[PDB]
Design an enzyme around this catalytic site. Structure first.
Site, PDB file in Angstrom:
ATOM      1  N   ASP A 226     111.595 -10.876   2.360  1.00  0.00           N
ATOM      2  CA  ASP A 226     110.814 -10.764   1.121  1.00  0.00           C
ATOM      3  C   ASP A 226     110.354 -12.161   0.626  1.00  0.00           C
ATOM      4  OD1 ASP A 226     111.422  -9.614  -2.349  1.00  0.00           O
ATOM      5  OD2 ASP A 226     109.545 -10.020  -1.261  1.00  0.00           O
TER       6      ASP A 226
ATOM      7  N   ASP B  84     103.130 -12.132  -0.183  1.00  0.00           N
ATOM      8  CA  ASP B  84     104.375 -11.324  -0.502  1.00  0.00           C
ATOM      9  C   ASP B  84     104.614 -10.289   0.529  1.00  0.00           C
ATOM     10  OD1 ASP B  84     106.481 -10.098  -1.502  1.00  0.00           O
ATOM     11  OD2 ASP B  84     105.577  -9.258  -3.294  1.00  0.00           O
TER      12      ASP B  84
HETATM   13  C1  1BB Z   1     110.575  -6.113  -2.194  1.00  0.00           C
HETATM   14  C2  1BB Z   1     110.779  -4.659  -2.700  1.00  0.00           C
HETATM   15  C3  1BB Z   1     111.871  -3.916  -1.878  1.00  0.00           C
HETATM   16  C4  1BB Z   1     111.190  -4.778  -4.161  1.00  0.00           C
HETATM   17  C5  1BB Z   1     111.272  -3.414  -4.789  1.00  0.00           C
HETATM   18  C6  1BB Z   1     112.233  -3.116  -5.721  1.00  0.00           C
HETATM   19  C7  1BB Z   1     112.210  -1.788  -6.238  1.00  0.00           C
HETATM   20 CL1  1BB Z   1     113.499  -1.324  -7.363  1.00  0.00          CL
HETATM   21  C8  1BB Z   1     111.295  -0.776  -5.922  1.00  0.00           C
HETATM   22  C9  1BB Z   1     110.354  -1.126  -4.969  1.00  0.00           C
HETATM   23  C10 1BB Z   1     110.334  -2.454  -4.458  1.00  0.00           C
HETATM   24  C11 1BB Z   1     109.294  -2.891  -3.477  1.00  0.00           C
HETATM   25  N1  1BB Z   1     108.147  -2.179  -3.471  1.00  0.00           N
HETATM   26  C12 1BB Z   1     107.042  -2.508  -2.548  1.00  0.00           C
HETATM   27  C13 1BB Z   1     107.051  -1.518  -1.322  1.00  0.00           C
HETATM   28  C14 1BB Z   1     108.267  -1.806  -0.403  1.00  0.00           C
HETATM   29  C15 1BB Z   1     109.429  -0.981  -0.383  1.00  0.00           C
HETATM   30  C16 1BB Z   1     110.477  -1.383   0.510  1.00  0.00           C
HETATM   31  C17 1BB Z   1     110.402  -2.537   1.329  1.00  0.00           C
HETATM   32  C18 1BB Z   1     109.231  -3.371   1.287  1.00  0.00           C
HETATM   33  C19 1BB Z   1     108.190  -2.938   0.418  1.00  0.00           C
HETATM   34  C20 1BB Z   1     105.785  -2.254  -3.299  1.00  0.00           C
HETATM   35  N2  1BB Z   1     104.611  -2.464  -2.681  1.00  0.00           N
HETATM   36  C21 1BB Z   1     103.427  -2.094  -3.268  1.00  0.00           C
HETATM   37  O1  1BB Z   1     102.346  -2.254  -2.706  1.00  0.00           O
HETATM   38  C22 1BB Z   1     103.450  -1.444  -4.592  1.00  0.00           C
HETATM   39  C23 1BB Z   1     102.343  -1.098  -5.178  1.00  0.00           C
HETATM   40  N3  1BB Z   1     101.336  -0.762  -5.693  1.00  0.00           N
HETATM   41  C24 1BB Z   1     104.698  -1.279  -5.193  1.00  0.00           C
HETATM   42  N4  1BB Z   1     105.829  -1.628  -4.533  1.00  0.00           N
HETATM   43  N5  1BB Z   1     109.500  -3.921  -2.699  1.00  0.00           N
END
Ligand code: 1BB
Ligand code: ZN
Ligand code: ZN
Ligand code: ZN
Ligand code: ZN
Length: 390
Positions: free
Chosen positions: A34, A220
């Protein structure tokens, strides 16, 4: 760096992870890569979607820091107990370091059904570490304790299984073709960069370039989508809709909330435009562009109900915290996070996404006589102003 090539795995839309070991004897876990945060945190108690987790009681080298940490997201949260342990990357450099580790004791909407990672490796800088910037991030301990060069690079290759490479300490020429172009790291917190111009099928959005970076632009690997500030996202959707107007899709599609489908193998890729983001160059007055195909921003989602059909999700979405160059952007490119030289490099990845007639590209230079400052200065809070950094 043949040992590090192919050391990433993941699921589409659930990021990319690398194996790491924690403790002695070594407990192996899969850890999300990340570049948008700066804690190393690992699941450290039972969870219904985990089948392994860091067991501090089984590590003879574990030391407790006797301090908790609480990390809220707009989507969920994790919290835990800070400590230190020995950490290595089995398919990385041949070294072991004593790093800070947050042992996640409770979380909400963080670990997802079927994801396969048990923790997260925050690769960005101390300023954004929780609970504060005195908690040294993993990569900082790595470089300080070993002779590993202060650089890492990511080749993210496009639930479907995905793969890639994180080269730690180096740049592996076999993972890209053509030129490597560098844009400056504007400030070391996120991997913050400056976008100077945006084009959709060669047409300039003609916005004030500060709008592109309002209130920051960041690279990111922890984000799936390309996310764009509201005004930019609206101008982009307007342009992509114009280009694709032979197809009238529902509002939910443009929101990312609905798939759109064609008969298998017939998707009309030609009606969806390329998007070019021009990044500030190392030389004043120069930029270079990264050009994204529609196959990067329209993500396939395998339909359970229509076998005959190729179905897609729109993977550009609105932001209120700036532009986010997530997996949608990175999957095109070999991205070098050159922390030593405070710059980020982009070259066309050796795992290319194909379109019949067009290619994801990295091209420059483009010169502007007019050197407007396209960075945004985030309004300084009294909270920020007052903290001492000794
Ligand atoms: C780093 C990490 C785990 C941090 C995170 C924390 C939480 Cl609680 C819920 C989701 C995320 C999250 N979401 C990413 C997708 C993700 C999930 C798991 C692993 C990597 C990415 C995300 N991307 C988008 O494009 C978006 C929008 N719009 C919203 N969220 N990424
Ligand atoms: Zn809870
Ligand atoms: Zn498993
Ligand atoms: Zn002081
Ligand atoms: Zn400080």
């Amino acid at each position: 760096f043949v040992e590090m090539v192919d050391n990433l795995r993941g699921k589409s839309g659930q990021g990319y992870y690398v194996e790491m070991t924690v403790g002695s004897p070594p407990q192996t876990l899969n850890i999300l890569v990340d570049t948008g945060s700066s804690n190393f945190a690992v699941g450290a108690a039972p969870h219904p979607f985990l089948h392994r987790y860091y067991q501090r009681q089984l590590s003879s080298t574990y030391r407790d820091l006797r301090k908790g940490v609480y990390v809220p997201y707009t989507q969920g949260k994790w919290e835990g107990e800070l400590g230190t342990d020995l950490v290595s990357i089995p398919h990385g450099p041949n070294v072991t370091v004593r790093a800070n580790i947050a042992a996640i004791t409770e979380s909400d909407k963080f670990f997802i059904n079927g994801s396969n990672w048990e923790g997260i490796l925050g690769l960005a800088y101390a300023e954004i570490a929780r609970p504060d910037d005195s908690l040294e991030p993993f990569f900082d301990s790595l470089v300080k304790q070993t002779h590993v060069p202060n650089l890492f690079s990511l080749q993210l290759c496009g639930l479907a299984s995905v793969g890639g490479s994180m080269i730690i300490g180096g740049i592996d020429h076999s993972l890209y073709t053509g030129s490597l172009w560098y844009t400056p790291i504007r400030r070391e917190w996120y991997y913050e960069v400056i976008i100077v111009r945006v084009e959709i099928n060669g047409q300039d959005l003609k916005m004030d370039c500060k709008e592109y970076n309002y209130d920051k632009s960041i690279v990111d690997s922890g984000t799936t989508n390309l996310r764009l500030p509201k005004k930019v996202f609206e101008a982009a959707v307007k342009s992509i809709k114009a280009a694709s107007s032979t197809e009238k899709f529902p509002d939910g599609f443009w929101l990312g909330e609905q798939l759109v489908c064609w008969q298998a193998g017939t998707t009309p890729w030609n009606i969806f435009p390329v998007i070019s983001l021009y990044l500030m160059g190392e030389v004043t007055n120069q930029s270079f562009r990264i050009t994204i195909l529609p196959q990067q921003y329209l993500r396939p989602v395998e339909d359970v109900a229509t076998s005959q059909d190729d179905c897609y999700k729109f993977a550009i979405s609105q932001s209120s915290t700036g532009t986010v160059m997530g997996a949608v952007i990175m999957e095109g490119f070999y991205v070098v996070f050159d922390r030593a030289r405070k710059r980020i490099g982009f070259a066309v990845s050796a795992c290319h996404v194909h379109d019949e007639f067009r290619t994801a590209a990295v091209e420059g230079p483009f010169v502007t006589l007019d050197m407007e400052d396209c960075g945004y200065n985030i309004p300084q809070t009294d909270e920020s102003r007052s903290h001492h950094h000794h």
